[PDB]
Amino acid sequence: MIIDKLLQVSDGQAVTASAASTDVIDFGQANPNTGMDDRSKMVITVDESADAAGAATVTFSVQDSADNATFADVAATGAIGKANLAAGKQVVIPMPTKLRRYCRVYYTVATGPLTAGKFSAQVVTGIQQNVAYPDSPRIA
Amino acid sequence: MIIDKLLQVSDGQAVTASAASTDVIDFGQANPNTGMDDRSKMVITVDESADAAGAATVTFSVQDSADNATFADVAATGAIGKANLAAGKQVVIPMPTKLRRYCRVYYTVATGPLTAGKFSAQVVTGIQQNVAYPDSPRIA
Amino acid sequence: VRSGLPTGTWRKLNYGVQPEKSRTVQVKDSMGMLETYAEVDKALADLNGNSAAWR
Amino acid sequence: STTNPTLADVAARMTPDGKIDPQIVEMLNETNEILDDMTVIEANGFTEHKTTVRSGLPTGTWRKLNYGVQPEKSRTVQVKDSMGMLETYAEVDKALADLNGNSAAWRLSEDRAFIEGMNQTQATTLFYGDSSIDAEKFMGLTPRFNSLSAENGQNIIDAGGTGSDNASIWLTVWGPNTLHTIYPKGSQAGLQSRDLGEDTLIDAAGGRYQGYRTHYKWDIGLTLRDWRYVVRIANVDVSELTKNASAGADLIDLMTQAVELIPNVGMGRPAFYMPRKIRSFLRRQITNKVAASTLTMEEIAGKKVVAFDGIPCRRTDALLLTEARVV
């Protein structure tokens, strides 16, 4: 899976409290709207794991702004419970269809605070997702 | 905007309390993943308006389940305010990429209860969104 | 459709300036289907044989 | 935080099901036409172009018989005017352009927005070019003609409109000794789109990032040998224009007084410069003026203005419509 060196935000961020991502992606236009590509999409990988006192949930959500100052949710995941975030767990959010300049990733952390966990958020084209599917299934 | 009547849920449902959609979409498999067709997306249109005692917000969200019984959020919008729900406001939620059988649409309403306003949710390919973009803007 | 131009810069001497990027949004817009059936009871159309003339 | 610019992975944003979109719709580009029309001669000085201009004539005297009259002297000032260089390099990751197999298609499409941003910038600056504040840029038609006090204050014609919503029309005469552009000796004008080729870039980390780059030099300044060849028609209140040259300020006459302000258009070649707005109103007003005379039924809309005097008439987008009123 190719990753853009530049659109990478929150490289391996130790989200312990409900913090926003380290870096904020800044497009060079007022309403980039890159959801229209039907091609770009935010992906969050997990490392090593969302270990916490528990049971807590960690919600990934994209935020817009007119300017790099005040953000608001334009996409969200939902309460991904803990113990669904072992290393190698992609929460894919398709790009919201109506973007503004400056998108970021906030980690809506449900209580209690996480004790361990990094996360990698980046916009790609596209995810590498291939689970094997059953066949007959009488055999196998 | 073409619509599949079968992928239509909440034909014109009058959202007053934070309730779920009338109909629940049933796919003919355990992991339809029709988020993966990279083409499908939920659209919620608004009529007539987010009339409420206020100030209220309406969070549109898609939910999966294994079976038609217990749902969990797979995409979400954020607290879209009243008076952002004029007659004619397409809120697109891109189809989540990991769908399970039975998708539904829930309306998370912030207090107070919405007093008038219907919403029609449907999976389409894709929305009609062609808003005008600036030209000079010096002239003009 | 092109959304943003690179502007270029007046550059003061001896100073390696920024590269530009031409931002550009695209728009999709849909179709709609307008169609209708036109039914008549065959008994009503058949009389005086104006079945075809009626249709 | 925010990474600028510097070409992301929205190479994807410019494509269909397929390759780079050939038919991208050029929205923000405007077809103002000075850049084609203006003349270029190499500047004479180092970072400038000097011009000696006669400031005072000797008077002469009637002499009474038997009485030596005074000898006379031509006091004379000389004036030079400065430049600016306008360029950018334009770098892209080699892989992003190569992928989906669109190496040249991207280079081209990224390029066209570049020639256009270049023309837009050269052209907007040529008319509203400062230097007491912007320092870096060459100074253009305003404010060499700003205040009515100037020796060319006679050259600016008050259209009579007031308030903040008021345009101006320009008429210049481009030729070697009346008004022209300059590029330094010997950097040549105009716009040189040189391609730097593939070369390595350097990561913030230390990482080779084998990738592309393109140059766009374009360095000009601007000689106004004598303002006599240029007339400014300031304060054309555009909200107040009406096609029947009735309310507000009429264009056709206001303009013929501009042709009459120029001493003997002999050289080199004259041109009108008006915002697309005015070009429209000047059109409506011409057909409004001849209709009360002799205009045909089919020519009821009127031919779009081309040669006003004849002088070529150039549409210029890159000319501000709401410029602050002059006093």
Instruction: Give rounded-to-5 percent helix, strand, coil for chain A.
Output: 5, 35, 60
Q: Token pair 């190569």 is at which residue?
A: D98
Indicate the residue of C25, C27, C28 with minimum beta-carbon distance to A29. C25
3-state secondary structure of D273: strand
- State whether residue B140 sits within 8 Å of chain D by CB: yes
CA torsion sign, A72 to A76 to A81 to A83?
A: negative
Nearest residue of chain D to residue C10 (CA atoms): D86
Q: Please, after which residues is chain A broken with C–N above 2.5 Å? A: none
Q: Token pair 């196998």 is at which residue?
A: A140
Indicate the residue of C3, C31, C32 with minimum beta-carbon distance to B133. C3
Contacts of D3 in chain C (CB under 8 A): none
Alpha-carbon span D284 to D245, nearest angstrom: 9
What structural domains and CATH numbers belong to chain B?
1-140 (2.60.120.1110)
Amino acid identity for residue B4 in this structure: D
Closest to D246 in 3D by CA, of D296, D274, D280, D284: D284
* Closest-CA distance of chain B to residue D27, Å: 5
CA torsion sign, D123 to D129 to D133 to D137?
A: positive
Contacts of A36 in chain C (CB under 8 A): 25-28
Distinct helix (H) and strand (E) counts, chain B: 0, 7
Nearest residue of chain C to residue D25 (CA atoms): C1
Contact C54, C40 (CB under 8 A): yes
D321, two tokens:
């419509």
Give DSSP secondary structure letters for D113-159.
HHHHHHHHHHHHHHHB--SSSS-SSPPBHHHHT-STTSTTTTTBPP-
Cross-chain Cβ contact A92/B74 below 8 Å: no
* Closest-CA distance of chain B to residue A115, Å: 25
Alpha-carbon span B27 to B35, nearest angstrom: 12
C39, two tokens:
């039914």
Cross-chain Cβ contact D317/B134 below 8 Å: no
Beta bridge partners of C39: none
Experimental approach was cryo-EM
Cross-chain Cβ contact D114/C3 below 8 Å: no
Closest to B68 in 3D by CA, of B36, B20, B109: B20
- State whether residue C28 sits within 8 Å of chain B by CB: yes
Indicate the residue of B1, B2, B130 with minimum beta-carbon distance to C27. B130
Q: Domain-by-domain residue ranges, chain D? A: 1-327
3-state secondary structure of D107: helix
| Backbone Cα Rg of chain A | 16
Nearest residue of chain A to residue C22 (CA atoms): A28
Indicate the residue of B2, B129, B133 with minimum beta-carbon distance to C31. B2
Indicate the residue of D3, D10, D13 with minimum beta-carbon distance to A26. D3
Q: Token pair 């909440």 is at which residue?
A: B10
Contact B92, B43 (CB under 8 A): yes
Indicate the residue of A79, A92, A98 with minimum beta-carbon distance to B73. A79
Contact B139, D277 (CB under 8 A): yes
- State whether residue D10 sits within 8 Å of chain A by CB: yes
| Chain centroid to CA D11 | 33
Amino acid identity for residue D78 in this structure: Q
| Chain centroid to CA A125 | 14
Q: List the Cα angle D222/D224/D227 in 5-degree steps.
A: 150
* Closest-CA distance of chain D to residue C30, Å: 16
Residues ≥6 apart with Cβ < 8 Å to D209:
A5, D93, D200, D201, D202, D203
Alpha-carbon span D162 to D104, nearest angstrom: 52
Q: Say if residue D206 is preceded by a cis peptide, omega within 30 of 0.
A: no
Contacts of B136 in chain D (CB under 8 A): 28, 30, 317
Give, as one character, the DSSP assignment of residue D312. B
Contact A94, B94 (CB under 8 A): yes
Q: Token pair 């280079």 is at which residue?
A: D107
Closest to D121 in 3D by CA, of D215, D220, D38: D220
CA torsion sign, D96 to D101 to D106 to D108?
A: positive
Alpha-carbon span D306 to D299, nearest angstrom: 15
Closest to B131 in 3D by CA, of A66, A63, C25: C25
Contact A40, D12 (CB under 8 A): yes
Beta bridge partners of D312: D307
Q: Token pair 């990698």 is at which residue?
A: A120
Cross-chain Cβ contact C22/D136 below 8 Å: no
Closest to D198 in 3D by CA, of D190, D209, D186: D209
Cross-chain Cβ contact C25/A28 below 8 Å: no
Alpha-carbon span D111 to D212, nearest angstrom: 13
Helix (H) or strand (E) holding D141: helix D141-144
Cross-chain Cβ contact B139/D30 below 8 Å: yes
Contacts of D25 in chain C (CB under 8 A): 1-2
Helix (H) or strand (E) holding D277: helix D276-290
CB-count burial class (<10 Å; 0-12, 13-18, 19+) for D209: middle
Contacts of D3 in chain A (CB under 8 A): 6, 23, 25-26
Alpha-carbon span D194 to D186, nearest angstrom: 17
Range 116-135 of D in CB contact (< 8 A) with B = 124
